[PDB]
Design a protein around this ligand. Structure first.
Ligand SMILES: CC(=O)O[C@H]1C(=O)[C@@]2(C)[C@H]([C@H](OC(=O)c3ccccc3)[C@]3(O)C[C@H](OC(=O)[C@H](O)[C@@H](NC(=O)c4ccccc4)c4ccccc4)C(C)=C1C3(C)C)[C@]1(OC(C)=O)CO[C@@H]1C[C@@H]2O
Ligand SMILES: Nc1nc2c(ncn2[C@@H]2O[C@H](COP(=O)(O)OP(=O)(O)OP(=O)(O)O)[C@@H](O)[C@H]2O)c(=O)[nH]1
Ligand SMILES: Nc1nc2c(ncn2[C@@H]2O[C@H](COP(=O)(O)OP(=O)(O)O)[C@@H](O)[C@H]2O)c(=O)[nH]1
Ligand SMILES: [Mg+2]
Lengths: 429, 441, 345
């Protein structure tokens, strides 16, 4: 059966994957020991998509946690679902990157890529058939960007027929949790565009505004944003694990949501998102979910979709529903809002409906979109970059580790050309 | 004897076949364990009719069918559901990975080394059949399995067996509604290969059945397990003369001889009598005239194409239940008297007639109502060119930029294989525009 | 930009093809090049900017080798002489007439040798002691979007062909890291280099025939001009460079009649993708010449990437297709002509 290998690069990768396994176990009925404690016989039929079996009816996940400087690894082992992971898969070296793309692609990444890829082969060759891989990292910073991109390159050199699906946290417009963000983001995009099939551009400000406006939360920590991102992660790969009326997968979404290979940067979203009081004052139905989905305040990309046209979008539904209502609503969205849709694609939407919803809901939807508003996530990066590169601001730390300015100009040149390919379809034709 | 193999391909065909067999088992008397206490209580008769069901010595009845999807998430419902104990355990999944909506993987990358099993089971299920023959492929234009695997299987069965009546009850893409952004390519790519080998392919569209189901059956929130049952009723009205006794029978080659004037124009439309709900079954007569006048009503057509922009090359009317021929003849005459139903001058006859006695069954927990008569129309008209003129336009928009094409060339396929498959469909449209013109002496 | 010049050529019947008496499917009426199936059904028409007929030595407009040079390749030297770059792409399957067209026979020269010899003639004619001329040669190949060198003599071991990589200079443009470059003064040198290059090129013995091609070859000349003598100190100030790129592509080979599996299938995908993107680029540039607003996908492949300063800008580009007139090769002829038409529009 189809299978995924997850990798966790960077603090964020490891701060999100924990919450993702906490959600998969909740759906599949596994405890910290690995033991099955479910209720239905439909949680174990396709458990192989994420987990491997063990001796005493225990289940071990296929995680490979690579992080230079073992500080963030130690936090997992002293956590709820830390003692289910394989200790042989925790691969970490000391002297962390230091938010340097050079110290996580060239020196220490090169030290620690062989030990990572060994476990990759160990886990992959023990799969019946393999579909693709999965990685969670944060651009702008160090480890997660550089080491992640290095692993992606090595793997797509080894296994190119298979999917590499990165779920990447991106920089924000106003907040700057890290000062060398544009440079690392530029280099990471230059390495991801050529070596990726579909990546998802999560952004933190959008998640904060989702947590404050819709959820009406007052003290939203990181576990809540990771909760939203895990939600989406789980929903994408549902139709491999559970059955339904119109089954989807990663490769159908890839063949459909990607008209040209370089435009594989999407905006995600999750839907039923309500407050603890406003769930008695609505009605879960397909139209309410679609309205929550196409709204600009449930997308995670920090990019208002109304500043550009949708090239393609996808809705993965979960629950007992009616395909008539689904298609009628997705057609009304096209016929009303045609100015936000592209004309050389007659139907810009697809659908996917599973039959098994989450542990405590009747309906659920995830939303994905390839748009042209994503310009304003990279144009800014190409403006922060050149304001810093024109004066050689944060540079000597990177030249000092066996690098050159040519690579940086190249990466800038590649991001700008991406922005041009996007702008080509933002005026009506 | 007489026999008909039923092949299902993809997730459209499986979910349809499940409904079809839920209907067939209840019509004949079989229960999901294969056994038949009806015979043990009655003590005779071929009611376990040998067209669809092979019979062992232990009283079981195992049906003549295969079904493939290249992904086990679908058929593993059958290996777990109610019909576990009925169907042969050879349900040839080889679904290590799906066809991802491309003809490219359904035709060559994940097609080769798997079709051999299908052809082997077909050889094993044909040599057990010393009778009339003909195969029924159930697939959907638009998938990677409904397109390429179908085009691969028919081009091989046209070598292995040859002069046999092959048929295809295929799902058709709706104009506006569609659940994929690639069906315009798969549709015409499949039509290129399945226009020379096949003999008569009946087409059905989801939007038509959806629009029917609220207007008549009063369902505003329908699903896929309430259109697949109507599809099974159509298949049963098509395949009933093989099984049940009747006043005027029509077999498999006859649909192929009446409704296919030229080799290439073998793509008609279908209808039934769904003005019939549980409450509206009363308040209504359901005569032969009233039901047959639902033929020419575009509101009851099962493919989105108004026939009043075209003419009828041929038509076939299969009647079930309590029907008397003069009622059918009055219906046909009342139809011909009208001027909204145009007919090609090279066909003044126009119609077939086929009558059988066994009425349709009610799949319990269902929407349709008990009837004393049912009707099916199979109509070859020149209107469906319009229903293709949209598809060949969509192609011509997204093939201008060469969009969604690198995924197909990535799984072994030429970029000049779409220009060669789009230059044949325009010829077919031109053929329809040619035959529909009346001759000037 | 300037008008990409597409051209065709219909080779004559071969010796065996005339002995076995194969039929004729492709006809011409001046500019029109139509294709009549023997007995099936409708005829497909095709129209191009230039058309060459080489079926028999009677017809008006028999385009021999000299006419092919003098109508397509000759003015490209002129623009290659005024400092502007130029590219000529060949396209066609095996058994269609590329090697007879581009290189040719020792008694019937192709386009490459006439190019080089007319070059050297115009060089030595103008070679005063105030205006010099330097030439620089190179030869490489794309195999599964990996750039390999061919002048490099290899050792007898396992995988020795080192894959070089591309890089973008902010001023010059895209280029190759480690592609050797050699000086040339006599075409004998170019021949002794090109034979050595072709002997190393990737060419698998496909089930149809042994001699084929599974890699895209590029043959680059650089023409450097030292026209500079200032009247104040007699010292060289400026220096023009022009790039000439003669490219030999590979065939479609749809994996359908040729059940391929393994390394002979990945090559297919690479070739088809490169041809799908190059046609896209040439179409977008043809639209760019027509005063519209278009984006040229240059980074979706390698050849489109390295040849980016030669195609666009104030350049001039050329393409030659080769088609067989027999009836057994109708699918390949159609696949080539349709491709060429897409390049045109
Ligand atoms: C009956 C009912 O309405 O209770 C809900 C509830 O009130 C709300 C507030 C829940 C609640 O969600 C949150 O509180 C929340 C807070 C911050 C950030 C994100 C979520 C709920 O906690 C969440 C919880 O939903 C789940 O448990 C899902 O399975 C969820 N998984 C987990 O929550 C989880 C469990 C263990 C460990 C880690 C995560 C899930 C989400 C997506 C995909 C798969 C599973 C449920 C029913 C509720 C509460 C409990 C209040 C909602 O949960 C979601 C996203 O499904 C938010 O929208 C739904 C419905 C309601 O608004
Ligand atoms: N009427 C009807 N149509 C269906 C049903 N299931 C799927 N379809 C249609 O068929 C198309 C789905 O493509 P499929 O042919 O199922 O794809 P597939 O055959 O599963 O093969 P893949 O494309 O590889 O998944 C959609 O356009 C649906 O409208 C069904 O139960 N009934
Ligand atoms: N969502 C989320 N983001 C985080 C978390 N921790 C760090 N980040 C993000 O990661 C970025 C910093 O990169 P970081 O992972 O620390 O660099 P690294 O240590 O080299 O991998 C910042 O932009 C943060 O927004 C977390 O727990 N949750
Ligand atoms: Mg499927």
């Amino acid at each position: 059966m189809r299978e995924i290998v997850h990798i966790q690069a960077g603090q964020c990768g490891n701060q999100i994957g924990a919450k993702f396994w906490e959600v998969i176990s909740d759906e599949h009925g596994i405890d910290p020991t690995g033991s099955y404690h479910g209720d239905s016989d439909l949680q174990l039929e396709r458990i192989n998509v994420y987990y491997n079996e063990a001796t005493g009816n225990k289940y071990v996940p296929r995680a490979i946690l690579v992080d230079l400087e073992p500080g963030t690894m130690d936090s997992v082992r002293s956590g709820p679902f830390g003692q289910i992971f394989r200790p042989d898969n925790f691969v970490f070296g000391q002297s962390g990157a230091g938010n340097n793309w050079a110290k996580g692609h060239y020196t220490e990444g090169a030290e620690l890529v062989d030990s990572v890829l060994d476990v990759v082969r160990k886990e992959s060759e023990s799969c019946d058939c393999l579909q693709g891989f999965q990685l969670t990292h944060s651009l702008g910073g160090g480890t997660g960007s550089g080491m992640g991109t290095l692993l992606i390159s090595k793997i797509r050199e080894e296994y190119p027929d298979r999917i590499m699906n990165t779920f990447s946290v991106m920089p924000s417009p106003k907040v700057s949790d890290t000062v060398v963000e544009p440079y690392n983001a530029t280099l990471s995009v230059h390495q991801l565009v050529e070596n990726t099939d579909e990546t998802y551009c999560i952004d933190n400000e959008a998640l904060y505004d989702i947590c404050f406006r819709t959820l009406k939360l007052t003290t939203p920590t990181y576990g809540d944003l990771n909760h939203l991102v895990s939600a989406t992660m789980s929903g994408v790969t549902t139709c491999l694990r559970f059955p339904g009326q119109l089954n989807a997968d990663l490769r159908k979404l890839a063949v459909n949501m990607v008209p040209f290979p370089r435009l594989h940067f999407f905006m995600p979203g999750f839907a039923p998102l309500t407050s603890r009081g406003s769930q008695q004052y609505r009605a879960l139905t397909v139209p309410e979910l679609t309205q929550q989905m196409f709204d600009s305040k449930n997308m995670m990309a920090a990019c208002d979709p109304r500043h550009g046209r949708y090239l393609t979008v996808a809705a993965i539904f979960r629950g007992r529903m009616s395909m008539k209502e689904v298609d009628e609503q997705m057609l009304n969205v096209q016929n009303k809002n045609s100015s936000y849709f592209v004309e050389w694609i007659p139907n810009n939407v697809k659908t996917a409906v599973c039959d098994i919803p989450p542990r405590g809901l009747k309906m659920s939807a995830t939303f994905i979109g390839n748009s042209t508003a994503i310009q304003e996530l990279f144009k800014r990066i190409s403006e922060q970059f050149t304001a810093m590169f024109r004066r050689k601001a944060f540079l000597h730390w990177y030249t000092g580790e066996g690098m050159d300015e040519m690579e940086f100009t190249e990466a800038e040149s590649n991001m700008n050309d991406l922005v041009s390919e996007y702008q080509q379809y933002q005026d009506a034709t | 004897m007489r026999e008909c193999i039923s092949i299902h391909v993809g997730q459209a065909g499986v979910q349809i076949g499940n409904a079809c067999w839920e209907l067939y088992c209840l019509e004949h008397g079989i229960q999901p364990d294969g056994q038949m206490p009806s015979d043990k209580t009655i003590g005779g008769g071929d009611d376990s009719f040998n067209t669809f069901f092979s019979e062992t010595g232990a009283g079981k009845h195992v049906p003549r069918a295969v079904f493939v999807d290249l992904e086990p998430t679908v058929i593993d419902e059958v290996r777990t559901g109610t019909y576990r104990q009925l169907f042969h355990p050879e349900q040839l999944i080889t679904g290590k990975e799906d066809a991802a909506n491309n003809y490219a993987r359904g035709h060559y990358t994940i097609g080769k080394e798997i079709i051999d099993l299908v052809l082997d089971r077909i050889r094993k299920l044909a040599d057990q059949c010393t009778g009339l023959q003909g195969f029924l492929v159930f697939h959907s234009f638009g998938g990677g399995t409904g397109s390429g695997f179908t085009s691969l299987l028919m081009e091989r069965l046209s070598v292995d067996y040859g002069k046999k009546s092959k048929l295809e009850f295929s799902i058709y893409p709706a104009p506006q509604v569609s659940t994929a952004v690639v069906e315009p390519y798969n549709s015409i790519l499949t039509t290129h290969t399945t226009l020379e080998h096949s003999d008569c392919a009946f087409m059905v569209d989801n939007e038509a059945i959806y629009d029917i189901c609220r207007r008549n059956l009063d369902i505003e929130r329908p699903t896929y397990t309430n259109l697949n049952r109507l599809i099974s009723q159509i298949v049963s009205s098509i395949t009933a003369s093989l099984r049940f006794d009747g006043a005027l029978n029509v077999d498999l080659t006859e649909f192929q001889t009446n409704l296919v004037p030229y080799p290439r124009i073998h793509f008609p439309l279908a209808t039934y009598a769904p003005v019939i709900s549980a409450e509206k079954a009363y308040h209504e007569q359901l005569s032969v005239a009233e039901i047959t006048n639902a033929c020419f009503e575009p509101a009851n057509q099962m493919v989105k194409c108004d026939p009043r922009h075209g003419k009828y090359m041929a038509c076939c009317l299969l009647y079930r239940g309590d029907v008397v021929p003069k009622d059918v003849n009055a219906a046909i005459a009342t139809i011909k008297t009208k001027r909204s139903i145009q007919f090609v001058d090279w066909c003044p006859t126009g119609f077939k007639v086929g009558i059988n006695y066994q009425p349709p069954t009610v799949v319990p927990g269902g929407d349709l109502a008990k009837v004393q008569r049912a009707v099916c129309m199979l109509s070859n008209t020149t209107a469906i060119a319009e229903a293709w003129a949209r598809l060949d336009h969509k192609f011509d928009l997204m093939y201008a930029k060469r969009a969604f094409v690198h995924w197909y060339v990535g799984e072994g396929m030429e970029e000049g294989e779409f220009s060669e498959a789009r230059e044949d469909m325009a010829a077919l449209e031109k053929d329809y525009e040619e035959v529909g013109v009346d001759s000037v002496e | 930009n300037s008008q990409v010049t597409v051209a065709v050529r219909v080779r004559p019947f071969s010796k065996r093809e005339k002995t076995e008496k194969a039929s004729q499917v492709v006809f011409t009426n001046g500019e029109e090049i139509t294709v009549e199936h023997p007995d099936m059904k409708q005829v497909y028409s095709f129209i191009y900017d230039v058309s060459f007929w080489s079926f028999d030595e009677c017809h008006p407009g028999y385009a021999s080798q000299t006419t092919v040079y003098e109508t397509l390749a000759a003015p490209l030297l002129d623009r290659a002489f005024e400092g502007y770059n130029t590219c000529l792409f060949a396209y066609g399957q095996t058994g269609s007439g590329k090697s007879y067209t581009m290189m040719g026979l020792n008694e019937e020269p192709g386009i490459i040798p006439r190019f080089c010899e007319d070059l050297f003639a115009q060089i030595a004619k103008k070679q005063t002691s105030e205006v010099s001329y330097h030439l620089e040669m190179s030869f490489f190949e794309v195999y599964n979007e990996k750039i390999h060198d061919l002048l490099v003599c290899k050792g007898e071991n396992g995988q020795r062909k080192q894959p070089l990589r591309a890089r973008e200079h902010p001023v010059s443009g895209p280029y190759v890291e480690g592609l050797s470059m050699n000086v040339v003064s006599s075409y004998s040198d170019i021949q002794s280099w090109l034979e050595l290059g072709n002997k190393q090129r990737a060419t698998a013995a496909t089930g149809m025939n042994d001699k084929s091609s599974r890699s895209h070859s590029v043959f680059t000349l650089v023409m450097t001009q030292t026209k500079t003598e200032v009247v104040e100190g007699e010292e060289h100030d400026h220096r023009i460079t022009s790039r000439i790129n003669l490219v030999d592509l590979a065939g479609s080979e749809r994996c359908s009649t040729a059940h391929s599996s393994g390394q002979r299938l990945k090559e297919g995908v690479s070739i088809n993708k490169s041809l799908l993107t190059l046609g896209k680029v040439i179409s977008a540039l043809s639209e760019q010449a027509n005063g519209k607003r278009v984006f040229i996908p240059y980074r979706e492949s390698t050849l489109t990437w390295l040849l980016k300063e030669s195609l666009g800008g104030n350049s001039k580009t050329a393409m030659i297709a080769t088609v067989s007139p027999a009836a057994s090769n109708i699918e390949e002829t159609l696949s080539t002509l349709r491709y060429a038409t897409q390049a045109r529009l």
